Amino acid sequence: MKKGTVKWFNAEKGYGFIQQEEGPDVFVHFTAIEADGFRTLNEGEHVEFEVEPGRGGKGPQAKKVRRI
Template structure:
């Protein structure tokens, strides 16, 4: 996976109680499923709606894409696929919303 390019996107929504959500890819492709176990973090693994993230894509047995090795975006800006708004990327650990 070291040579696999990382994708960038914005968290569309993430349900902390159920531990899953969806990412809207920056390239405009279909939304990508994300499970809390795919989030790289030393602490509580969760995402917040609107966060800019980087991830790898794997395809499930049914052909649907899933995000793995999910981290907060560290460089560049991410454009929201839903609003077209440019959001500066954030840095640091993934932290739970309070």
């Protein structure tokens, strides 16, 4: 499980990328956010994402994202 602030999350297409203390590179989609309402994050806000293996096109994906 990883936690960090988001840098940008395109809701139009349904994709985004979260950044941690260092800002590696995680693949997150609108269908990967688990919140109470509209599945999406906020630019400059904190959110916990669960990097998964066979989930992200590149590898580690936010299989489980949470609003913070």
